[PDB]
Design a protein around this nucleic acid. Structure first.
Length: 56
RNA sequence: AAUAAAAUAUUACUUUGGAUAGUUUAGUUUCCUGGGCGAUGAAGAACGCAAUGAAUUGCGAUAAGUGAUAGGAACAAUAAAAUGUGAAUAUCCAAAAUUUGAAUGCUUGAAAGUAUACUAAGGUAUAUAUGAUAUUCAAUAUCCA
């Protein structure tokens, strides 16, 4: 056979087919555009950059 | 010999201290009823959430609270709003339940992380041992055309 090693033969690998859902968690993303940004920084230092550097 | 500053003695009042007396939403012991946790993720730990909170308490991205069932007019430190078209309050109920932790895809020091499959992001599954069933195989191990 031209090889001195015996490995585990390849067998059929079926894909997972569960008979009932594992989790029923509702499909709602809790990290949306509203929750990501809490509020702008309204300090004097943060208000100075909004004219020149065009930054928020 | 002499004076009473100091020194000493008693009482009243004040002071320092917190004994004594009155008191208890705290304990101790005995007895009665149970002894009702967890891969459907426990106990424990961390972080976060109140209009003004640091602890504590309650809770989990629906946050000092949501729905439902009872309940019937409050809360309060200060403002506000909502409120008999139902406020406080209670519950062996329903929804929801961040990071961890037996911790279980892999790694974890105070580590930031990360692979595949299914259903760009998000969510599920994938540890080890193990019983049953199905299925793909390995061994001339026993026969055998």
């Amino acid at each position: 056979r031209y090889t001195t090693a015996f490995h585990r033969p390849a067998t059929k690998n079926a894909a997972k087919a569960p008979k009932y859902p594992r989790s029923l968690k509702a499909n709602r993303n809790k990290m949306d555009e509203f929750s990501i940004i809490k509020f702008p920084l309204a300090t004097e230092t943060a208000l100075k950059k909004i004219e020149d550097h065009n930054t928020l």
